[PDB]
A paper describes a structure:
In the current study, perdeuterated Pyrococcus furiosus rubredoxin was produced with the iron atom from the [Fe-4S] cluster replaced by the 113Cd isotope. The present demonstration takes advantage of the neutron anomalous scattering properties of 113Cd, the availability of modern high-intensity monochromatic neutron beamlines such as D19 at the ILL, and protein perdeuteration to determine the structure of a biological macromolecule using de novo phasing in a reasonable timescale.
In the current study the anomalous scatterer was introduced in the metal chelating site using chemical reagents to remove the native iron prior to isomorphous replacement with the 113Cd isotope. As pointed out by Bacon19, isotopic replacement of hydrogen by deuterium atoms in a crystal provides a crucial advantage in all but eliminating hydrogen incoherent scattering and thus enhancing the visibility of the anomalous signal. Anomalous protein phasing work using X-rays can be delicate when carried out at room temperature, and neutron approaches, for which radiation damage effects are essentially negligible, provide a way of tackling these problems. Experiments close to physiological temperatures can highlight structural differences induced by cryo-cooling, and which may be more representative of in vivo structures and their resulting functionalities.
Author numbering: 0 to 53
């Protein structure tokens, strides 16, 4: 699945891994994350992520 980078800190949201410690099971697409989900490292909102693809 896709990877998304936080433009603030460099954390990678990997859809294959999810974010289970913050309530997100593996295989959750970025677009399916709750509107209130934030970067687990720096707290950046979803707006600050960019998908890693051309």
């Amino acid at each position: 699945m896709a990877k998304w980078v936080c433009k603030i800190c460099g954390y990678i949201y990997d859809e294959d891994a999810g974010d289970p410690d913050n309530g997100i099971s593996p295989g959750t697409k970025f677009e399916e994350l709750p509107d209130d989900w934030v970067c687990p490292i720096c707290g950046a909102p979803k707006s600050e992520f960019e998908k890693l693809e051309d």
